[PDB]
Design a protein around this nucleic acid. Structure first.
Ligand code: MG
Ligand code: MG
Ligand code: MG
Ligand code: MG
Ligand code: MG
Ligand code: MG
Ligand code: MG
Ligand code: MG
Ligand code: MG
Ligand code: MG
Ligand code: MG
Ligand code: MG
Ligand code: MG
Ligand code: MG
Ligand code: MG
Ligand code: MG
Ligand code: MG
Lengths: 24, 87, 71, 69, 118, 179
RNA sequence: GCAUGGCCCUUACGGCCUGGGCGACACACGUGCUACAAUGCCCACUACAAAGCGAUGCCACCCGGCAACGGGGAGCUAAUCGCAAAAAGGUGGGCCCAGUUCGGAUUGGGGUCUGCAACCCGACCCCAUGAAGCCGGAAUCGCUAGUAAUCGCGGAUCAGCCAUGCCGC
RNA sequence: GCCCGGAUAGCUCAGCCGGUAGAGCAGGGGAUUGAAAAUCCCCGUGUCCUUGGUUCGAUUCCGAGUCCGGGCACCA
RNA sequence: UCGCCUCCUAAAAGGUAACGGAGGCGCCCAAAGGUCCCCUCAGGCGGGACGGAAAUCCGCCGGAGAGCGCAAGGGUAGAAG
């Protein structure tokens, strides 16, 4: 899913945070 | 897609607005293809630079949340012709 | 007349998101509607969906109008 | 001898079957001048589509083969 | 369970089923379910008339789905073809519009395997 | 009970009589027919017919349409001595109002678009004839049954004459116009 | 890059500026990234690194927002503060073999942030789309050990970033 | 008339005892070579003669029909 | 070239030749037949969603120029269409 922005992996990869990977 | 600001060149804006004081000639060419299509100015004929020449744009009004540049394609292209490899 | 084929012919409801409208007499009950929400005849319409969000409030009638260019 | 109406033509010379060497095709514009003007060579070379070396060579062929009409 | 249109998921979780609508992603979908007291993990093949319409009401009233939406896009698309909009001449030419590269790739908006070598 | 009905008998009818009018209770501009031809979108029938335009469009006006067929030779159009390529529907009286009125001021709208009806479009006897870009888009939608964007071309024949007498009848009846 | 013999231009082959272009697109090839899924995917929770980088910089902790971010605001001249939290793993639940909760292209729309300015041409966030791909022909590349494979982390450049690159851990 | 055989891509032809249509020529891409030949791979092209049947399904099976080909009849 | 059909040559009845002029036939239709009942064209000009300069529509104007399986002629809407 590394290219799927709407996911855990997707975010981690892109190096960002959001609704799908909150800043803890 | 900028922010809480809306952008337009102060001097492309003037020529326009002071013109709305009386209204007239569409002879108004600007190189500011970078400024937002003048909402409070729906009807003049703007001559947006093409990088080569000034392409007049009727600028109707259905086009207000855009830029004067979106109406002056800067590249010229009309299909390709032949390939050739071996080099 | 013509027996058979013909629709059914029955009244229903013309809803409307801006007050009642035509009186049943077609063949449809529900529908988006929107008679006109602004007619259009000459004016009272031309609601030109272009309204630059929050117009004015910024970049307005300033910068110094024409000025004493006459001198 | 001389021409009456200005003409534009292309000179081709492709040599590549076995592949020994290669070729040197070119195009030119030829038009008549007032009587007594003689010969003239217009060096209209753009971004260098032709080497500043083969030019006199393509001219020593025009001028040369220009002997007999 | 005809919802927005004629799409009746079933045999599949309600949260995943809805998805099959043209305007319902795992997002919105998962919302409507908690705004209708419906248990997500419940198969459609178990939804009660109550819940079914009790849900059909929300989904089908809030935002504009299948078809309705479809038309929207088409409209927006054609509107970009006005006086000379670039993002518009882009749809016309049939190439990418989001500033992509065309020297290579761009296949998603072109014909796979065109060839033409002189 | 009828919708417009009144609109014409009550309104329009008098504004005309004295704006024109006079003498007879007959030489007053009034509609008498409402026909409408589809043609079959941007691609005609084909042995595998279409007839959905029939069944659907039929009841989008309340009453099945007929089927017209070409004539003469075609050559570069694909047709022949004809059969079919038509499918149109006339109709007057009641249905004329109901179709255009319970669709005139509520239906015609919605379709994402500009100003009013093309002005210079009338002739003599005042009949007009608009012609939306077909686009079966609204009214009476109830989706599904969606195969082609086929729509139509509406013909409205009225009494009257000239263009004013005619136009006055529509304009004062509910026909937004001129750009 | 620089230096340098010779040749060449000196109201221009030098200089300034606005705008464009280097981002073009019928096509061909190279290096790569993300994949086609169950030894997998998604969600919640819970662990174990190293090497680096930071004052008109890194920015704790609060608060609004679903987010990106925004207001506030402590510490830190940094083995003393923080960028962090590592990911793969582990545990519980969900998916049940389908072009799918695989895959994410593409497109519409709504926003955020840098900068005078993001039409050409930025990066993020969110909603809606959701494509080709379920394993790849002739051919062809890498590696002999903490290597290959796989997982994440840092840095230079840098306002920002088209880094899926590069040098490192 | 009788028996037997044939018609498949622009041409030359395989089509196996029912499901799907293919080599070859030509051309276009690739691959291999330091490079050019030679060689390899990958493409796009069908009323499968026409008709009726049989079958879930026919270019294939069955019956007829036309046009070829072979042999033998014979033609008021 | 050789039989058949249409027009002309053929000199206003019929007929009339030439290696005179110009075209067709060696079929076809179970509805393209019988009868009963309805319907009227082609184009010209307007007005018309895709619409060529003829798709199908609407409004006038239009005695036949349309149509009638195929040549040509005759005939024909007061129908043979
Ligand atoms: Mg996914
Ligand atoms: Mg640039
Ligand atoms: Mg470059
Ligand atoms: Mg580009
Ligand atoms: Mg990989
Ligand atoms: Mg919060
Ligand atoms: Mg598990
Ligand atoms: Mg930009
Ligand atoms: Mg999808
Ligand atoms: Mg596929
Ligand atoms: Mg699979
Ligand atoms: Mg070794
Ligand atoms: Mg950076
Ligand atoms: Mg980009
Ligand atoms: Mg005689
Ligand atoms: Mg006589
Ligand atoms: Mg009969």
């Amino acid at each position: 899913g590394k290219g799927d922005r709407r996911t855990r992996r997707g975010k981690i990869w892109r190096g960002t945070y959001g609704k799908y990977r909150p800043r803890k | 897609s900028l922010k809480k600001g809306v952008f337009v060149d102060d001097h492309l804006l003037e020529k326009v607005l002071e013109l709305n004081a009386k209204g007239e000639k569409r002879l108004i060419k600007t190189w500011s293809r970078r400024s937002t299509i003048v909402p409070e100015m729906v009807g003049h004929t703007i001559a947006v630079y093409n990088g080569k020449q000034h392409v007049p744009v009727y600028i109707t009004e259905n086009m207000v949340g855009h830029k004067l540049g979106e109406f002056a394609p800067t590249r010229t292209y009309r299909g390709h012709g032949k390939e050739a490899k071996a080099t | 007349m013509k027996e058979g084929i013909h629709p059914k012919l029955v009244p229903a409801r013309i809803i409307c998101g801006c007050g009642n409208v035509i009186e049943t007499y077609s063949t449809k009950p529900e529908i988006y509607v929107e008679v006109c929400s602004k007619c259009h005849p000459f004016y009272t319409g031309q609601q030109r969906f272009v309204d630059t969000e929050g117009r004015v409030e910024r970049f307005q009638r300033r910068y110094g109008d024409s000025y004493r260019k006459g001198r | 001898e001389t021409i009456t109406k200005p003409v534009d033509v292309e000179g081709k010379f492709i040599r590549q079957t076995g592949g020994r060497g290669q070729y040197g095709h070119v195009k030119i514009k030829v038009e008549p001048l007032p009587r007594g003007s003689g010969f003239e060579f217009v060096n209209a070379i753009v971004g260098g589509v032709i080497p500043k070396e083969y030019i006199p060579a393509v001219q020593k062929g025009i001028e040369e083969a220009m002997q007999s009409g | 369970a005809r919802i927005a249109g004629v799409e009746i998921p079933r045999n599949k979780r309600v949260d995943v089923a809805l998805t099959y609508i043209y305007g319902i992603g795992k997002a919105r979908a998962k919302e409507a379910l908690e705004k209708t007291g419906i248990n997500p993990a419940t198969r459609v093949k178990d939804l009660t008339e109550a819940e079914v319409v009790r849900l059909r009401e929300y989904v089908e009233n809030t935002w504009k789905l299948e078809g309705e939406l479809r038309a929207e896009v088409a409209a927006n698309i054609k509107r970009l073809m006005d006086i000379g909009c670039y993002r518009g001449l882009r749809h016309r030419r049939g190439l990418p519009v989001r500033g992509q590269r065309t020297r290579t790739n761009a296949r998603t908006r072109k014909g796979p395997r065109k060839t033409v070598a002189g | 009970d009828v919708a417009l009905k009144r609109k014409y008998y009550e309104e329009v009818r008098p504004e005309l009589i004295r704006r024109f009018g006079y003498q007879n209770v007959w030489e007053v501009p009034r509609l008498e027919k409402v026909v409408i031809n589809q043609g079959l979108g941007e691609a005609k029938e084909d042995a595998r017919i279409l007839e959905k335009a029939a069944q659907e469009l039929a009841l989008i006006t309340g009453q099945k349409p007929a089927v017209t067929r070409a004539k003469k030779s075609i050559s570069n159009f694909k047709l022949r001595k004809g059969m079919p390529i038509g499918l149109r529907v006339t109709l007057r009286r009641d249905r004329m109002w109901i179709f255009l009125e319970k669709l005139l001021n509520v239906a015609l709208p919605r379709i994402r678009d500009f100003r009013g009806l093309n002005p210079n479009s009338f002739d003599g006897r005042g009949n007009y004839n608009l012609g939306l870009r077909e686009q079966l888009i609204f009214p009476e939608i109830t989706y599904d049954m969606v195969d082609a964007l086929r729509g139509m071309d509406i013909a409205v024949v009225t009494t009257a004459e000239t263009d004013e007498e005619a136009r006055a009848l529509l304009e004062l009846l509910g026909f937004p116009f001129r750009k």
